[PDB]
Amino acid sequence: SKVVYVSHDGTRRELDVADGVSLMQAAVSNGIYDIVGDCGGSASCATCHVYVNEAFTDKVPAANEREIGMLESVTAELKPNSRLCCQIIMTPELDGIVVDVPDRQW
Numbered sequence: 001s002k003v004v005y006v007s008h009d010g011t012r013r014e015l016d017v018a019d020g021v022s023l024m025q026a027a028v029s030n031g032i033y034d035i036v037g038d039c040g041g042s043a044s045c046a047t048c049h050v051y052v053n054e055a056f057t058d059k060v061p062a063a064n065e066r067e068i069g070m071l072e073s074v075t076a077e078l079k080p081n082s083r084l085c086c087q088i089i090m091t092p093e094l095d096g097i098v099v100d101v102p103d104r105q106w
């Protein structure tokens with residue numbers, strides 16, 4: 001399924017992500033350098049921060065308590081649509097999802 005990672009300067013990078021793969025994993029294994037994913041996807045670091053386009057924030061599972069706590073420590077601006085993309089699992093239902101990546105993770 002399609003996922004578009006828009007870098008902070010506007011570059012739209014599209015990837016085909018298989019079902020069950022997190023957006024963080026697909027990102028770090030396909031050159032999306034603006035996403036670090038340091039902890040490996042256990043909602044333990046804040047380095048996979050992205051802004052989910054509002055047309056999809058409702059189709060994606062709500063952030064659990066751990067993510068909510070971790071998001072408080074994001075280094076870039078924290079927005080209402082901020083999410084740790086390691087917590088977003090790709091599914092056909094999300095095909096076309098767009099996420100904007102901040103200018104910093106650390």
Ligand code: FES
Pocket residue numbers: 024036037038039040041042043044045046047048070084085086087
């Ligand atoms: S990869 Fe660490 S919180 Fe997402």
